[PDB]
Amino acid sequence: MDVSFRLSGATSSSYGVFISNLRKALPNERKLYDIPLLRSSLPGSQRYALIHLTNYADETISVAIDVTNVYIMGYRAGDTSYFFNEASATEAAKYVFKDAMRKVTLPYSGNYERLQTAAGKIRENIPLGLPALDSAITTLFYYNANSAASALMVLIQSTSEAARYKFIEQQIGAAVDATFLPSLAIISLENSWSALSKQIQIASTNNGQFESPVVLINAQNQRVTITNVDAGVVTSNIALLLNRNNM
């Protein structure tokens, strides 16, 4: 299922609607504690979906994502496609944006470690919020190489991370006319998706108890250890689980 989000006239509601639609395009056979469990894997012809993003100036880029883990493989702007420099993207290039006659291989893979190095900035130094997304779209639309890395980090957190965590969704969506620097509470959630997903799956057959704790940071910068599905992050935050079979 194709989905989309328009910055022109965007509101907290319209962003919520978009995130809601993004989550819906992700297939799942089961749910654990009402949280959809993503597929272990899918055939190339079902593995990808597109996210059409339109900035204020009405310029649009299509972002390709792997629906089993919500990872961005690359994006398309007009007749040019852009793929991350990694095996995942190379594989996706065989299925998406195949009519784009210009194919560009970005100089980095899509993980934070690589991107932060290319950007010379870590996530916490990069503003988020709808206006941030607009600007990121612009730099990707015209491919402003020296700013693409940070822009991609804005794109990832505004889509992938937002889909995974309702909290991140709230924070980014509330920032309609201004931006903000992401808290460690947000970064913490982003860094712990695999772990939380794994522990919740184990918990489903381990009396609701985690095998290993997951440490997060709350809004007061204190470390909070998660050990069971009664934790708030499990009850009222995490909106998708990465399959144990799929990293």
Number of domains forming the structure of the chain? 2
Q: Indicate whether 202 and 88 sit together in one domain.
A: no
CATH number of the domain encompassing residue 129: 3.40.420.10
Q: Indicate whether 156 and 169 sit together in one domain.
A: no
In the residue annotation, 169 being an active-site residue is answered as no
Helix (H), strand (E) counts: the chain:
11, 10
Are 151 and 139 in contact by the 8 Å Cβ rule? The answer is yes
Are 224 and 217 in contact by the 8 Å Cβ rule? The answer is yes
CATH number of the domain encompassing residue 205: 4.10.470.10
Q: Indicate whether 130 and 8 sit together in one domain.
A: yes
Q: Indicate whether 156 and 198 sit together in one domain.
A: no
User: Which residues span the domain enclosing 174?
Assistant: 164-247
DSSP string, 97-160: STT-SEEEE-SS-SSHHHHHHHHTS-GGGS-BSHHHHHHHHHHHHTT-HHHHHHHHHHHHIIII
Measured distance CA(128)–CA(130) in Å, rounded: 7
Q: Indicate whether 115 and 214 sit together in one domain.
A: no
Are 85 and 131 in contact by the 8 Å Cβ rule? The answer is no
Whole-number Cα distances in Å, 107 to 83, 146, 160, 215, 218: 9, 11, 21, 32, 34
How many Cβ atoms sit within 10 Å of the Cβ of residue 48? 18
What resolution does the deposited structure have, in angstroms? Answer: 2.4
Q: Indicate whether 133 and 45 sit together in one domain.
A: yes
Q: Indicate whether 150 and 176 sit together in one domain.
A: no
Q: Indicate whether 137 and 65 sit together in one domain.
A: yes
Q: Beta 71-77 vs 80-83: how paired, if at all?
A: antiparallel
Measured distance CA(139)–CA(7) in Å, rounded: 15
Closest CA to 133 of 150, 111, 145: 150
Q: Indicate whether 172 and 103 sit together in one domain.
A: no
Q: Indicate whether 53 and 172 sit together in one domain.
A: no
Measured distance CA(36)–CA(23) in Å, rounded: 9
Positive or negative CA dihedral for 11, 33, 236, 246? negative
101, 131, 163 — which closes off a domain? 163
Q: Beta 60-66 vs 48-54: how paired, if at all?
A: antiparallel
Candidates 59, 86, 161, 190; catalytic one: 161
- Which long-range contacts (C-beta less than 8 Å, at least 24 apart) are formed by 56-59? 56/7, 56/8, 56/134, 57/138, 58/8, 59/137, 59/138, 59/141
Q: Indicate whether 187 and 156 sit together in one domain.
A: no
How many Cβ atoms sit within 10 Å of the Cβ of residue 40? 11
How many Cβ atoms sit within 10 Å of the Cβ of residue 107? 12
Q: Indicate whether 168 and 193 sit together in one domain.
A: yes
Measured distance CA(181)–CA(153) in Å, rounded: 13
Which residues are bridge partners to 193 per DSSP? Answer: none
